[PDB]
Design a protein around this ligand. Structure first.
Ligand SMILES: [Mg+2]
Ligand SMILES: [Mg+2]
Ligand SMILES: [Mg+2]
Ligand SMILES: [Mg+2]
Ligand SMILES: [Mg+2]
Ligand SMILES: [Mg+2]
Ligand SMILES: [Mg+2]
Ligand SMILES: [Mg+2]
Ligand SMILES: [Mg+2]
Ligand SMILES: [Mg+2]
Ligand SMILES: [Mg+2]
Ligand SMILES: [Mg+2]
Ligand SMILES: [Mg+2]
Ligand SMILES: [Mg+2]
Ligand SMILES: [Mg+2]
Ligand SMILES: [Mg+2]
Ligand SMILES: [Mg+2]
Ligand SMILES: [Mg+2]
Ligand SMILES: [Mg+2]
Ligand SMILES: [Mg+2]
Ligand SMILES: [Mg+2]
Ligand SMILES: [Mg+2]
Ligand SMILES: [Mg+2]
Ligand SMILES: [Mg+2]
Ligand SMILES: [Mg+2]
Ligand SMILES: [Mg+2]
Ligand SMILES: [Mg+2]
Ligand SMILES: [Mg+2]
Ligand SMILES: [Mg+2]
Ligand SMILES: [Mg+2]
Ligand SMILES: [Mg+2]
Ligand SMILES: [Mg+2]
Ligand SMILES: [Mg+2]
Ligand SMILES: [Mg+2]
Ligand SMILES: [Mg+2]
Ligand SMILES: [Mg+2]
Ligand SMILES: [Mg+2]
Ligand SMILES: [Mg+2]
Ligand SMILES: [Mg+2]
Ligand SMILES: [Mg+2]
Ligand SMILES: [Mg+2]
Ligand SMILES: [Mg+2]
Ligand SMILES: [Mg+2]
Ligand SMILES: [Mg+2]
Ligand SMILES: [Mg+2]
Ligand SMILES: [Mg+2]
Ligand SMILES: [Mg+2]
Ligand SMILES: [Mg+2]
Ligand SMILES: [Mg+2]
Ligand SMILES: [Mg+2]
Ligand SMILES: [Mg+2]
Ligand SMILES: [Mg+2]
Ligand SMILES: [Mg+2]
Lengths: 96, 127, 49, 172, 106, 197
RNA sequence: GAAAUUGUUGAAAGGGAAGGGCAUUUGAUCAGACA
RNA sequence: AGAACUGGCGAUGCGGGAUGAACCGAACGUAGAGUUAAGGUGCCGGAAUACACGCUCAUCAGACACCACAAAAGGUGUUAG
RNA sequence: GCCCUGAAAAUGGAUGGCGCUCAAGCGUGUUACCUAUACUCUACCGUCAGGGUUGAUAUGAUGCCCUGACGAGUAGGCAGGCGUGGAGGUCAGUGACGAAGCCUAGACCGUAAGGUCGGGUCGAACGGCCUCUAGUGCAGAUCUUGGUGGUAGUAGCAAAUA
RNA sequence: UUUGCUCCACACAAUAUAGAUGGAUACGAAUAAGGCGUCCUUGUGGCGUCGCUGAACCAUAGCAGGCUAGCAACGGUGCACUUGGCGGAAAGGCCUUGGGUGCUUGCUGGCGAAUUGCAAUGUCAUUUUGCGUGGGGAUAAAUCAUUUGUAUACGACUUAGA
């Protein structure tokens, strides 16, 4: 099994955003800021990616993360992780 | 400039170093024969160093010649140098190592007059 | 020469190496077999003990 | 033991005062050179007569050529052979074009079927089976049936270079 | 045109050897398209260049050549033996090598 | 001969395919081997299954890591056969091996390149008809290999595209022949006949 | 003011020792003969 | 473990028998060219995936002297008598 | 005859390995081909042998010249040589304008023991040749004395209340 | 940290090479059977034909291929552009549109080549890198220390800090 593309949401919580870092405070927090631009242009690129997942792809997983701030814990940095998605049909999956 | 001679053929130019002279500092490189009983070298097992033996000895003809065709003759002074006067095509003078700088220039100078070759004419050369 | 008495070995060799894990988040090595006749939903979830 | 020739060999016991002109005996011998032939001759003679080579002489050695070397023939063959636990008489039939070819395959067949090497065999008779229906071993009658024909299925042609760009075919 | 080759392609196979001892003075060449000792009797004598490259320029070029010649045929399938001016380096087993058409006999 | 020789595994006898591939490397010839799952071994499936388990039990008693490694994939059963025919612990040996590549299936580049065969290792030329033999793909899938089905799938898909390629090509050479004909019996053509063309 | 043994500098090699033999590539280095 | 005759090893490398004191070939000055021995020529590995006729299919086949083992007894496997 | 049953042992494993099945297996035949320090021919070394040659006015008569055969080697014998302290003779030998010693993947002679040079360092003595003489040549002896390592910045420096 | 990075273009320098020297030239399947062409009732169909090796096919003439003219064709091909489409197994490549432009040995002309001295690879490939210039583009983070304890012998792990 080999990963083909990942498509990402446009806005990303600081909670996830800060999992992509080790020295969050000091940083310019530029994570995903060029990506976020890809939506602007009508949508073009994110489509063809979704679109290409649809065409190939034997399985689909979702990228989800915890709202660790809704939790009494100290660590502000959330947990992100792939969950396979089982409901019917490749295309129906990626739409979801 | 020496008597013509047949192509000088050296037969085994590689030095015969002592066995294990490469293995412990205590063992000098100078040839020395294995006498031990089990020894691979003394036994000539394919793979080990050769030992000197009479087959290697040089052509009676070209033996003792250095590349230029001249047997070399060690020289201390002019008198010595002059023993080579009727033999310039056969011997070359090597100036002895302990001959002084100003004495070398006399010798060198006379060898020139006599047409006698000198193998080490730049020793002590006050340049 | 031969044990003398017999006992089971100690502990299970299908859990080696008894090494520290590469991450605090243990990995889902396997997902449920997929039946594409059902509606779409996750097959796992995250939380804190 | 090789590629054979067949030899008439003639020998006799050495002459003597009281017995000049001794009897004279002949063997047809199948060997590859005349030197083996003569030796073979003395081998069997001493299996038969009071003689050794030491006290007897070769009188004549002549190669016999096949009479009709391009006529097919059904040979009957008789042999004595030694096994690992016994000795044995035997009859095979060979179909070829000369006695000399026949004896070559016999020796082969014996080595192949019975592991008998040359030292261990004694050809007794080799003779032409004049009229069929006295041919007896089936693996030969097989080839006497009228208007005979057969295919050679699964043709393997031998490639002359390591790679090929087709994919072969065994048609034929 | 596009082909300028005046030699036959060839291959540095092994040194002459036993099972367990090689002799660097004789190399064994496989000559492209020669399959039998008879076939190879043709190249006996032809000269061989092993052409290689270096970093120090010299007599003008950065290309040097080891020269040799074919000397006998070797075995049953057109392999050939050859000697060189200096024995070939043995990193060369499997390297290409050029066989010429001179000295000519046609 | 060519800079690269692509061999179609299918229908070949492992150890004969290995034996010739080894030599070619050693002589400087680059080789890639394809469809290694359609490789053959003499002996019925069970025999080579038993042989494989034999191999399967050799391992370093103190540490099964250091011990003999058992690759289950068809390309790699193959490579093993090969490697043993090459002095792989010498630099010259490593060199020859790097000229090799083995593949289950026929992946890009090579699927549009041509592949050849090796008649002296072609089962249907070698095995006495009657003898039983084994297909690598089936052998491997019974000792652990995981990807027979997915290769089969990709192949059947590849096999469709190439059937078109072909059909097109056959269509075009039909024309080509029809040209090379609307031009037979011409002067130049008769001339070339004379010279063997 | 040797050697064992050490520091620095320069150069080189190193997939479970190193060292050695025949041979050649490559790098460095150098004798001789020519006139 | 102890004798007989010879030949060897010990005191001896070289080629072969993967390996090995004694087997096979052959005994050694330094080297060029040729030819061979014993033993080999699918690939490792120099050398025919050579020719030819049979035989053998083994759910622990077999594969070369010394040599690194197998026996009585059995088979309606198959071959030739 | 081949094959199969008869046929049970301890780390995982050996027709040398891969692998081979109208063989790359078993029996037998026929060619070709690979390659030993062996055989043939040639050069060169050395050993032994047989000849030739005192004739000066030039140089080795233990010489020079022709020729033929042979060459393994422990213990062991003998021979020709290499090297060191010191002694007689000699070269009217080298040397403070640098002896001796020491360093040097620089040069050259010898099959070798070794010999010679260059360059650096050094500071007072030293060598070639014919002879004489011995406290005369080291890798070992759990060798003698002295010096030096890896081990290793390691074991450790924790009893007696602070 | 004294003007740094990246893609494109040529430029200079180095550096190297397991080994260019016309072209890796694409069904599948079967082998006691097939490929191709053709017809048809489209089928396990009729008829024809081929194999017996790639000994092929394609390319191939021109200063290592110079400078030039014309004709017959309207064909081939190289290059950069542009149209539509395909390929996710490692797609990273394939096909198609249209104008441009070079070459054409399809045929027919003009000019050139010597002295590289009778051979000497006689140098025409492609790898990695370094440094200037200037045509696009981009504007971070990790670590130490501090800190948490879901972690810990030390490192490591896991939190937190404009
Ligand atoms: Mg992508
Ligand atoms: Mg000693
Ligand atoms: Mg011992
Ligand atoms: Mg002994
Ligand atoms: Mg028990
Ligand atoms: Mg880790
Ligand atoms: Mg007759
Ligand atoms: Mg001092
Ligand atoms: Mg060397
Ligand atoms: Mg003894
Ligand atoms: Mg012996
Ligand atoms: Mg040996
Ligand atoms: Mg053995
Ligand atoms: Mg091997
Ligand atoms: Mg070979
Ligand atoms: Mg042959
Ligand atoms: Mg026996
Ligand atoms: Mg029995
Ligand atoms: Mg039976
Ligand atoms: Mg066995
Ligand atoms: Mg074998
Ligand atoms: Mg046989
Ligand atoms: Mg010799
Ligand atoms: Mg001789
Ligand atoms: Mg002797
Ligand atoms: Mg003395
Ligand atoms: Mg003395
Ligand atoms: Mg004294
Ligand atoms: Mg000198
Ligand atoms: Mg000085
Ligand atoms: Mg001094
Ligand atoms: Mg003083
Ligand atoms: Mg004396
Ligand atoms: Mg003493
Ligand atoms: Mg000693
Ligand atoms: Mg000592
Ligand atoms: Mg000692
Ligand atoms: Mg001693
Ligand atoms: Mg001591
Ligand atoms: Mg001490
Ligand atoms: Mg300290
Ligand atoms: Mg401590
Ligand atoms: Mg305490
Ligand atoms: Mg303590
Ligand atoms: Mg390389
Ligand atoms: Mg047909
Ligand atoms: Mg059709
Ligand atoms: Mg039909
Ligand atoms: Mg074709
Ligand atoms: Mg042109
Ligand atoms: Mg690839
Ligand atoms: Mg013209
Ligand atoms: Mg810039």
């Amino acid at each position: 099994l080999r990963s083909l593309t990942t498509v990402w949401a446009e806005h990303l919580s600081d909670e996830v955003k800060r999992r992509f870092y080790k020295n969050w405070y000091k940083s310019k927090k530029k994570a995903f800021t060029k990506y976020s631009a890809k939506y602007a242009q009508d949508g073009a690129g994110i489509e063809r990616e979704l679109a290409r997942i649809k065409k190939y792809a034997s399985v689909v997983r979702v990228l989800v993360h915890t709202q660790i701030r809704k939790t009494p814990l100290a660590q502000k940095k959330a947990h992100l992780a792939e969950i396979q998605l089982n409901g019917g049909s490749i295309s129906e999956k990626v739409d979801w | 400039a020496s008597l013509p001679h047949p192509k000088i053929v050296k037969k085994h130019t590689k030095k015969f170093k002592r066995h294990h002279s490469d293995r412990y500092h205590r063992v000098a490189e100078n040839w020395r024969k294995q006498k031990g009983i089990d020894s691979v070298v003394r036994r000539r097992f394919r793979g080990n160093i050769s030992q000197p033996k009479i087959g290697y000895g040089s052509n009676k003809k070209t033996k003792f010649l250095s590349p230029s065709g001249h047997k070399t003759f060690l020289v201390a002074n002019v008198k010595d140098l002059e023993t080579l006067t009727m033999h310039t095509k056969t011997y070359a003078a090597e100036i002895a190592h302990n001959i002084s700088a100003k004495n070398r220039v006399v010798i060198l100078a006379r060898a020139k007059a006599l047409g006698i070759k000198v193998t080490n004419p730049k020793g002590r050369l006050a340049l | 020469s031969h044990r003398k008495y017999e006992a089971p070995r100690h502990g299970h060799l299908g859990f080696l190496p008894r090494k520290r894990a590469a991450s605090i988040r243990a990995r889902v090595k396997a997902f449920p077999k997929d039946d594409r006749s059902k509606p779409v939903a996750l097959t796992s979830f995250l939380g804190y003990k | 033991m090789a590629h054979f020739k067949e030899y008439q060999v003639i020998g006799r016991r050495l002459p003597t005062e009281s017995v000049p002109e001794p009897k004279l005996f002949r063997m047809r011998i199948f060997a590859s050179n005349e030197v083996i032939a003569k030796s073979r001759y003395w081998y069997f003679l001493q299996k038969l007569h009071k003689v050794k080579k030491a006290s007897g002489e070769i009188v004549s050695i002549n190669q016999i050529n096949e009479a009709h070397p391009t006529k097919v023939k059904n040979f009957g063959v008789w042999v004595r052979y030694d096994s690992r636990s016994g000795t044995h008489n035997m009859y095979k039939e060979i179909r070829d074009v000369s006695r000399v070819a026949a004896v070559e395959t016999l020796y082969q067949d014996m080595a192949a079927r019975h592991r008998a090497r040359f030292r261990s065999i004694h050809i007794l008779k080799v003779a032409e089976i004049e009229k069929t229906a006295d041919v007896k071993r089936q693996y030969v009658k097989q080839f006497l049936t009228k208007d005979l024909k057969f295919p050679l299925p699964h043709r393997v042609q031998k490639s002359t270079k390591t790679f090929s760009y087709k994919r072969p075919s065994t048609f034929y | 045109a596009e082909s300028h080759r005046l030699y036959v392609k060839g291959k540095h196979l092994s040194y002459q050897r036993s099972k367990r001892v090689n002799n660097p003075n004789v190399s064994l060449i496989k000559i492209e398209g020669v399959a039998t000792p008879q076939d190879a009797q043709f190249y006996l004598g032809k000269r061989i260049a092993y052409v290689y490259r270096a970093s120090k320029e010299v007599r003008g070029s950065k290309i040097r050549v080891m020269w040799g010649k074919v000397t006998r045929t070797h075995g049953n399938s057109g392999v050939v033996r050859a000697t060189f001016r200096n024995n070939l380096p043995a990193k060369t087993f499997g390297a290409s090598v050029r066989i010429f058409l001179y000295p000519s006999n046609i | 001969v060519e800079p690269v020789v692509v061999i179609d595994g299918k229908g070949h006898l492992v150890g004969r395919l290995a034996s010739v591939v080894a030599k070619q490397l050693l002589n400087g010839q680059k080789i890639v081997v394809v469809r290694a799952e359609e490789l053959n071994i003499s002996g019925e499936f069970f025999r080579n299954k038993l042989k494989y388990h034999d191999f399967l039990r050799k391992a370093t008693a103190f540490n099964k890591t250091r011990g003999p490694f058992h690759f289950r994939a068809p390309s790699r059963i193959f490579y093993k056969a090969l490697r043993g025919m090459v002095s792989h612990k010498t630099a010259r040996g490593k060199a020859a091996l790097e000229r090799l590549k083995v593949f289950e299936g026929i992946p890009p580049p090579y699927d549009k390149k041509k592949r050849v065969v090796v008649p002296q290792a072609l089962r249907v030329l070698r095995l006495k008809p009657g003898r039983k033999y084994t297909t690598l793909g089936k052998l491997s899938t019974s000792v652990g290999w995981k990807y027979e089905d997915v290769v089969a799938k990709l192949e059947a898909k590849r096999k469709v595209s190439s059937a078109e390629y072909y059909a097109k090509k056959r269509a075009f050479t039909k024309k080509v022949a029809s040209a090379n004909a609307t031009a037979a019996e011409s002067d130049v053509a008769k001339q070339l006949a004379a010279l063997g063309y």
